[PDB]
Structure formats: C-alpha cells, structure tokens
Design a binder for this molecule. Structure first.
Ligand SMILES: N[C@@H](Cn1c2c(c(=O)[nH]c1=O)CSC2)C(=O)O
Ligand SMILES: [Cl-]
Ligand SMILES: [Cl-]
Ligand SMILES: [Cl-]
Ligand SMILES: [K+]
Ligand SMILES: [K+]
Length: 254
C-alpha cells in the first residue's frame, strides 16, 4: 500500500544522475537500465517507490567478523524494501538476503588496455608487473576470495597483498586501467559497455564464470515473488533484451 524504499548505487548505465539544467530531486534525479526496469515493475505490479542511494556506496560483502555492508546490509537491517542495481545473485549473499529471478546474465572477465597480447586470466596470475584487481566488497571480489580453483586462488593472493589493487568502484577501476598497467576484473555486461565507449580498452579472454543480476529483498519479503513473475513475463517477450539494447547502443569502435 505504501511506497517501497529502493536502495541503489551509481553504476553506469544501470543507475545514473539524469542530466538537466534544473536542480533535480526525488526519483526524477535518476535514469538508466535499472530505473527503466523499476518503472516497468512498478507499472505492472502497482506500487510506488522512493529511490535512495546507499550511504557507503557498496554492493555488499562480509568482513572477518561476519557483518555485512553495502546494499546487502540495507536489506538485512530492513532499511530498504528492494535493492535495484546490477546486484549479483550469489549463494553466499543468499545466507542474508533474497533475490528475484535474474533479469540479466553475465560473467566475470578482464578489462585491460589493448597493447599486450595476453589472452587468459591465467596469464595475469603468473606475473606481477601488470597489477590487477576488482571492486572492493563486490561479487567479483568475493568470487576470487572464495574460489577453490588453483588459478583464481593465485589471483586472490595478489589482490589480498597489494593495498590499492581493490578499488572503490568501477569508475575508479576503469580510470586506473587507463592510467596504469592495470587489469580490472569486471563483469561481462559492463565490459561490453566500457569497451564500446573507450576504444583503447578491450575484453581480455572469455568469461570466467556465469552469474545473473537480480533484484534483492529482505528474506521473506512479500514483494519478492511478485517481482520474479513480473521479470519472467518481461523476458518472455524479450522486453529486457530491448531494454539492454536501448542503454548499451552507441558509438562503436574502429
Ligand atoms: N555485481 C557486483 C558488483 N560489481 C559490479 C560490476 C563489476 O564489474 N564488478 C562488481 O563486483 C559492474 S555492475 C556491478 C555485486 O553485486 O557485488
Ligand atoms: Cl519521488
Ligand atoms: Cl539518495
Ligand atoms: Cl529478455
Ligand atoms: K542539474
Ligand atoms: K502507492
């Protein structure tokens, strides 16, 4: 009956500050793929919402004591009804929150500057000159932290070693990719987006694994099943494919 609290994060092209001469406020400040997805779910399901940015600007991971941060924490403490963001569905975070069915599929990969003909994530693990990392307290960071693959255990020992190999967000990871010999372990769909706009950047190698982005809710959320059915209906008619095309289309690279 009331307006849901939506926690989210600035992540292009998923959630961004709309451009305007006016000073914007409320939901009107935001636009992007996830905002379109939210508009569509709110229309189908008949709910309203208030979008709030998570104060610590993080997706969510556990520390050594087991406490969460990020949007995951927001759902745990019930300070948000939904998390609408490129939020990875992981069985680790299922210990604390719940997820709708995925609205987008992706995989971890490598964002690197075209110049060295490396082709594999293994090529990074067996050296030290090219520093590499991922977004701190994210699902890509946690995937290497908890992996049992001998190659990925090798890479996590690196990132655990260097202080600033773990970056605050994708923007600063991409910037570091352009200004240093650095490789960013980043998710497939973002790499597609960045490398279409930054012709100096390329995807290195295929996908490391497979995951899906879902809308997160508190455990036992009454809106969660309604969201899942709505998302599944949208994928049947390929409306989420159209929606990705709308926000990913652009210049292209020679
Ligand atoms: N999906 C991750 C966050 N996250 C994201 C991107 C990425 O490249 N790495 C990463 O960890 C680009 S969309 C968000 C999470 O939910 O923790
Ligand atoms: Cl509003
Ligand atoms: Cl806000
Ligand atoms: Cl679809
Ligand atoms: K403005
Ligand atoms: K309402």
């Amino acid at each position: 009956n009331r307006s849901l609290i939506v926690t989210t994060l600035l992540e292009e092209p998923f959630v961004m500050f709309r451009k305007s001469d006016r000073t914007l406020y409320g939901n009107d400040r935001f636009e992007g793929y996830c905002i379109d997805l939210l508009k569509e779910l709110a229309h189908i399901l008949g709910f309203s919402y208030e979008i709030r940015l998570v104060e610590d600007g993080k997706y969510g991971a556990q520390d050594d004591k087991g406490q969460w941060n990020g949007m995951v924490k927001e759902l745990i403490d019930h300070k948000a009804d939904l998390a609408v963001a490129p939020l990875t569905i992981t069985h680790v975070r299922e210990k604390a929150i719940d997820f709708s069915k995925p609205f987008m599929t992706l995989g971890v990969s490598i964002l690197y500057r075209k110049g060295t003909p490396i082709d594999s994530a293994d090529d990074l693990a067996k050296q030290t000159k090219i520093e590499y990392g991922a977004v701190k307290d994210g699902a890509t960071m946690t995937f290497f932290k908890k992996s049992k693959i001998s190659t990925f255990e090798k890479m996590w020992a690196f990132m655990s070693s260097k202080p600033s190999a773990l970056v605050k967000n994708n923007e600063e990871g991409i910037q570091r990719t352009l200004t240093a010999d650095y490789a960013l372990l980043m998710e497939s769909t973002t790499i597609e987006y960045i490398t279409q706009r930054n012709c100096n950047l390329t995807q290195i190698g295929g996908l490391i694994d497979s995951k899906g982005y879902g809308i997160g809710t508190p455990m036992g959320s009454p809106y969660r099943d309604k969201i899942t059915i709505a998302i599944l209906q949208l994928q049947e008619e390929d409306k989420l494919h159209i929606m990705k095309e709308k926000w990913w289309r652009g210049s292209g690279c020679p």
